[PDB]
Homo-oligomer: 259 residues x 3
């Protein structure tokens, strides 16, 4: 029964964690600023919907990373027998504690920012509501089952079963990104930029389940701090730059996306 203060200090006291969380808190703040600045020239209602859903990305990121930073959304979990990190222990407060410091707050950041990325990207491609619906529902399911995979301590096989369920919902989203919106963007006149934002997205998105698998939640070839910086690095790219790359195209082509 560790304290939130204990986790708040454990992080401050760990090189990798402290930096992995605070550098992204910093970059998220510098994004909300650069983006509110970049998008002042917009006036069309649709261009402005794409702008604000995009801007919400770093808004969700700064708040959710603060949840981790404060120790509010981190837990110490004891992994199941057979799990590569079972047996782990951590110095918290004045004692050794069984378990792995688990920053499950990362799934809350993901559950909140991915539907905004899909909404902005969907509108960019001129998607109809059905595909928008399909993408966002399976995306939320993908994130929430991943979180349940992370939170499952009862059994090792059960964790990988959730992982599989999360993979299946990922495939539906990948199909919409790669086969449906790739085609829809042509009617909307956004094919060029879509292929770029889609290529980045699909590449960075595929990275998450690979890291999960090799990182501490999986077979742990990557320690807690490195599992964290890998996720943090992927976030800076899949999120802030993605938002910069999409917003640098938008505030140059307001007419194409209007209506």
């Amino acid at each position: 029964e560790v304290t939130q203060r204990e986790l708040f200090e454990f992080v401050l006291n760990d090189p990798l964690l402290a930096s992995s969380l605070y550098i992204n808190i910093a970059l998220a703040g510098l994004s909300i600023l650069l983006f509110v600045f970049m998008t002042r020239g917009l006036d069309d209602p649709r261009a402005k919907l794409i702008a604000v859903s995009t801007i919400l990305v770093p808004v969700v990121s700064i708040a959710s990373y603060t949840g981790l930073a404060s120790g509010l959304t981190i837990s110490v979990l004891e992994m199941p027998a057979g799990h590569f990190a079972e047996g782990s222990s951590v110095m918290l407060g004045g004692e050794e504690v069984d378990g792995v410091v688990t920053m499950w707050g990362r799934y809350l950041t993901w559950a909140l920012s991915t539907p905004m990325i899909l909404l902005a990207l969907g509108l960019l491609a001129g998607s109809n509501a059905t595909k928008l619906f399909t993408a966002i529902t399976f995306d939320i399911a993908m994130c929430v089952t991943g979180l349940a995979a992370a939170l499952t301590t009862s059994s090792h096989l059960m964790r990988w079963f959730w992982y599989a369920i999360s993979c299946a919902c990922f495939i539906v989203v990948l199909y919409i990104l790669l086969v449906e919106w790739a085609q829809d963007a042509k009617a909307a006149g956004t094919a060029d930029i879509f292929s770029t934002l889609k290529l980045l997205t699909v590449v960075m998105w595929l990275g998450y389940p690979i890291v999960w698998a090799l990182g501490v939640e999986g077979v742990a070839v990557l320690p807690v701090g490195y599992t964290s910086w890998a996720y943090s690095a992927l976030d800076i790219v899949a999120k802030y730059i993605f938002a910069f790359l999409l917003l640098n195209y938008l505030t140059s082509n307001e007419g194409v996306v209007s209506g």
Copy 2:
């Protein structure tokens, strides 16, 4: 105290709970396979929305039932004074623990599946946005106030007050289903199929508060394993069979429900 692993083992070790939970993970998985295969012939955006909302029913089911099976969404709660299951105990991790194994994750399943059932039925009926909004918001309120009833350990009376508020929300959804979409479907050209599904929905849905009352959450004439099976049997019809029948009509009648959303 009571660890997630302790509950996962108890479930694997109890005839009614393991079968009531794992059979549904299995049927949900098979339902998804069948429904995807059935619906590959659809092209219309609106038909497809009725199809995806329906498909999300067993997707929500396989995921949330796994929540229960893994032990993640189970709690051991001690019932308040006068509750008919107060003072019960359950043998966990070898030790005796006061409380009733409470599979609260069931409300998470219902909270996620029911709005997908109403969206599909409302689209089937040719519902306007107002009634789609009224049915779904009151239905979600129904589930959450039901979960609240289940998690209340402070007072017996408090539990039944949450139960009554929940029922109030239910009556609003029944009204839309039985009064408004019935009329809407006639105008939409789907009256017959909407009428059969609506009645299958109302019949099975009335089953949940009855089971809640008769079961371990209410007066406990049904112990935990029997309460669990009563809820799992209702889920098989209200979720998987209901969906099979809806998609059977949809994939033979794409033209009637084709249009904007």
Copy 3:
């Protein structure tokens, strides 16, 4: 270690607490009954969508306040070093307990009812989906960061920080109300009622961060019971009266908001 029953009893047996909470369960219950009555003659789909969104206010209200009254959504929390309530204690379960009774369940009420407030106000003002999306998302973010600020016990600083993030979000909402929807309304033929509801809304809403700062979550000049009543007072006006007034204009101007 404090139980749910012990928090239901603490509340039940404290004059200020039982009153703040149970008075709002009763008023919401009556608001629902009254509002359903008032709106029984609406026919247009848009007006009905405004009515049901506004009726969801006391429904979210009766259920989330019960959340509080039952102990379900209350947590006794030890404030961090420096907080003006650090070291406080209560006496729950007959024992002296370190911390402050924290009715975090209030943020559930707000997170669930404020979006309904903006949808109904926005639709009244003729808002386009974009500003409605902007007002509701930032509103929800404001409420969740407020809850996080209230649930943070790790350091006094970080708490006031969440409070600030919850302000940057609130500022976005304020720009939409005061400015944008005021402009949108004029044309919707609701400029007049939009001014009255906007005034009440901006005024009452502004108080929440001030009460938070002054109450037990903040510098604690207001103990638990007064903190509860301070927030419960803003709710009674920001919710039930705001709702009555808005429905009163709806029951009278149905034709106006039907659009066509």
